[PDB]
Amino acid sequence: AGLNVGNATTVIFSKCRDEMFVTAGNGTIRVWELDLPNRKIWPTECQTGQMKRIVMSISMANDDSFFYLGTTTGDILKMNPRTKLLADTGPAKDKFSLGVSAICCLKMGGLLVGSGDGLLVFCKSPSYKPIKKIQLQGGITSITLRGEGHQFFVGT
Amino acid sequence: PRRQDPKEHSYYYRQGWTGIIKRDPGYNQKLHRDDREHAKSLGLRINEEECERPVGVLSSSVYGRRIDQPVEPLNRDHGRAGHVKADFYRKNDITSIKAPGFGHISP
Amino acid sequence: MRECISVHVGQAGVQIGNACWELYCLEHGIQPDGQMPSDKTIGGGDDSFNTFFSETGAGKHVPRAVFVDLEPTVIDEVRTGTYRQLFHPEQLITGKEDAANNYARGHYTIGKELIDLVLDRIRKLADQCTGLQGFLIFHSFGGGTGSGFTSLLMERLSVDYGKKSKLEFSIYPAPQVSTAVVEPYNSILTTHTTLEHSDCAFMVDNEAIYDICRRNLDIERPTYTNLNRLIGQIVSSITASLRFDGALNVDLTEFQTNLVPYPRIHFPLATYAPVISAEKAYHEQLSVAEITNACFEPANQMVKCDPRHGKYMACCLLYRGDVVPKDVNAAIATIKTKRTIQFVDWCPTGFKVGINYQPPTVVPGGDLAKVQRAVCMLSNTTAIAEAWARLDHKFDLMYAKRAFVHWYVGEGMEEGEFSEAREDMAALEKDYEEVGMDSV
Amino acid sequence: MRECISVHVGQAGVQIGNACWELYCLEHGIQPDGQMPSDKTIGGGDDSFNTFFSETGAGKHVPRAVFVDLEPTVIDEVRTGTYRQLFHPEQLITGKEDAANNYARGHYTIGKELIDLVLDRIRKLADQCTGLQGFLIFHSFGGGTGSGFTSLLMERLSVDYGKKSKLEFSIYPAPQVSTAVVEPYNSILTTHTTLEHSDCAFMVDNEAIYDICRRNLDIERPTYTNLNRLIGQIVSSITASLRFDGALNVDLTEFQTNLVPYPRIHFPLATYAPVISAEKAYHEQLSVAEITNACFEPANQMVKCDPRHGKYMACCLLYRGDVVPKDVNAAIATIKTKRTIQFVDWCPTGFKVGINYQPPTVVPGGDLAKVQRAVCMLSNTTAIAEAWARLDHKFDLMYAKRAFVHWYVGEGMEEGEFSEAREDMAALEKDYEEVGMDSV
Amino acid sequence: CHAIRDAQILEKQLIQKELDAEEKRLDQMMEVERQK
């Protein structure tokens, strides 16, 4: 993390083994690239406009398109690792509860978004609006997929 | 004009330039004038041309030939690693009057 | 850990610095590209480089040095050499005209053309330094800018930086062998600034080093590179405690007050003890006593002046490697009880011992076999006065006939300064014979 | 919704215009077709483009500029260049019969025939605006369609648009190099047009940047294209708070209430700090302390003036890039200790800061390297009066015997105007030494 | 200690081996110049 910004608590890889991506509870959205011969990494901070947020979960698409964030504000941030820029913000109105603590991007263009209350929501990309809602007890901390994704197991 | 019998007929380990068997107007940005084309040794590859020889011709390239043949693995144990400047001073969080928050597993 | 820059002036000073910075970057781990293969995260960050290196962010470690020579041949070979990415181009300041083995066009005529650029570049290093201890200035007393331009630096660095421990690593010319003809002139006309704003003037002549390389190191026909590798290991005990840990850590300000008794007397010697080659390195055991004894011996010294016909007054003994303190103080005891090695009455104490924990790293291609227990001695004796006296005889002979003067005065220098440097040397020689009488 | 209109008048202004509009398009993501592709769009809109461009429905961003010069050759190069589909076809006002170097041609003959056309397109551009905050002007201070033609605009914009900040970015004749023989003459005749009908005037020489890209960028033997890009980076730093996000955004009227002390003392200086080259960029740390110090050195001023021959009255430090606001206050504290920057009796504080959060953008094929940290220092000093006085001396010599006057009084004016323009210069100087006196 | 000291001889051998390989050709060189 930079010296102006804060500290990072998340990591993820991609569909090529040179990208490594971190978010933060202080906004350090940085898409690194791996440089084995010189044994160093090269970061690139992602511009998101003036949307400084606090985010605690990362998931990426199966075809390495876009990485997805779940912020404390209750906002799904989708950004590009190939142009280092934002693509789409979350729910305009009716935002989520205590911040999205678990995101799991499916093989489709969809995403199983959780909450700090247990509002597991399957939503699509452009509106981030709920399609099927079921309330879980406890704040959602883990959304796994049984491979193909027909039986996803949620931990709280 | 020396036609330079191949390889082992020079003090420099080289066959020599083949040479030229129009002069484009070029306003380039690295050298003072146009008639001193090798003023600051731009285009001179004297280090790379000295790395193909066994023994270099200048008596100043001997500093740093066998550097890629290390004789000793370095014992990096008795160092002077700074700990008072790096374990006392935090960067920025003000954590002391912050809540434990998300993921505060304690020993 | 603190910082110290190194201002190399002269063909000699930058070729000594060629062997020095080769050893420097090997000790820490900086490759000739200028990058460390391990990062500061991996290693529990080891800021041992900070004394001679400075990070830029991409891992590009930087020699805290300024190479200067007024003639462009010996500086362009380090902008085209293997260490061309390591240095900075603004650090490598060079000029057009030679000093031509002449003091006058080093200090007055040609030296003024680049005194502005170097003093700006000393400021660039000094600003980003936070604990700048000393100026480690490398030069030779027997040439041009190494006799010239360094004198204009010594005056300017004292007015600008004041008390910042202006050390000086220097090459004296030899009793018999000499590579110049005008060498006596520019070796006593520049020692004005040496007995002026310079606090510890380390001394080496070329001749003694050849004898060490022949006898101990067992190479005939030695070149100037092996002579400079010895100087690099001399620094690497002087700046070892600033870079590596030890039992008795010894700072660069410690050196002065432990070696200069009087403000005029500030000229030490240098001696590296376990300097033997590899074939005769299986042979000797080399524990602690034979190397404490080694620096104290005539045919291991680095300056052609015998300590037996003189009296020691201060001797800091710096140790590296696997040195155990009991082995030192027994070796201290056994050599303080020898008649030929004489200590003056106003130094009942003896030695300043410095123990370090880092064994010396060997240069690949270097002569010096690895030793797990090394000594670099910095003595201070009255016996250096015969080294000043042999060039005094040589200067007085070729000045009484006024030979080789029209090159000097006709280049921006007054005749009167020649007589001033004459009386100045008489004063220092009178001081050294004065400080070594036993008052009783 | 914070717009600025750039009025590039004369040869140099369009030449600076082709370098600045190259830069502006990169920053806001505008292709030479005037279009912004979807990939380089922050999600949704960005709003950081309307300060210098304007959307026209279909997806075409057009510059908010007026290019006028009294001859076709330079403007026709813009119409037949890569940016033919960027600039709108009507904002490239041309006319024929160049004002061959003559202030009279600007303010008598070929100036009044075109001045109604240019102010209409300024009126159309400033009617599309919501938050017009200034008039950026790029003229030449030596020529006919430079100092002469902009003398009509500022004396007609001031009566029409009233209270607006008229910022000038111009090229002043250098101390020893000058293209035309009429250059010192046509620089004091436009002082009745920049002292009252203006707000600020960013002086830029020619000889200075020639030395900037000789000692930092190492681009000896340069041309105008290189110089106009570095001037283009200056504007992009001054007008950066109006578009991007940061910690202390210094708006244009924020800027001038802090820069301009007295109503007639409004001629500041300019420096860009990271003017480092490409290979020397990796070979530097480029932290805030030394870039702020690199603004105050007397060799990086964009106008050939010694700043140590006068007194810094007001200062402002517009940092661009990743700058934490602690180390600026540390950098300010250092320059409050150094004696050589003497400020004034009447301003204890004397420092404004601006912390933007966007790194500088490099021209793809340019000279300035990827630095993630910049600052542009704009200083109102009493030391610019000697640049005024040096061209006064070149005037009085060529004035005294009446020469090159018949070309100038011939195409319509009076002989008297020389003296009052000279008296205005003498009154301009008289304030500058007056303000820089300590008061009791 | 015995390890890289053993290596140190082998480097010193290789320096002198190739220095001899350098000087043998210079003998062969100054011969061929004399042979013409």
Ligand SMILES: Nc1nc2c(ncn2[C@@H]2O[C@H](COP(=O)(O)OP(=O)(O)OP(=O)(O)O)[C@@H](O)[C@H]2O)c(=O)[nH]1
């Ligand atoms: N220690 C050491 N001393 C050297 C070396 N080479 C030369 N010297 C000494 O340096 C003296 C001359 O070198 P310099 O003082 O550097 O001469 P210079 O600076 O090139 O003088 P100008 O060419 O006139 O500018 C000689 O008398 C030698 O004693 C070296 O490689 N190592």
Ligand SMILES: Nc1nc2c(ncn2[C@@H]2O[C@H](COP(=O)(O)OP(=O)(O)OP(=O)(O)O)[C@@H](O)[C@H]2O)c(=O)[nH]1
């Ligand atoms: N830095 C820079 N200076 C320029 C450039 N073009 C002109 N200048 C300077 O500006 C001075 C004035 O010349 P012009 O730009 O032709 O001024 P002008 O009013 O357009 O002259 P005319 O077209 O004859 O009326 C010249 O002496 C140059 O020194 C440029 O592209 N870059």
Ligand SMILES: [Mg+2]
């Ligand atoms: Mg030389």
Ligand SMILES: [Mg+2]
């Ligand atoms: Mg023109």
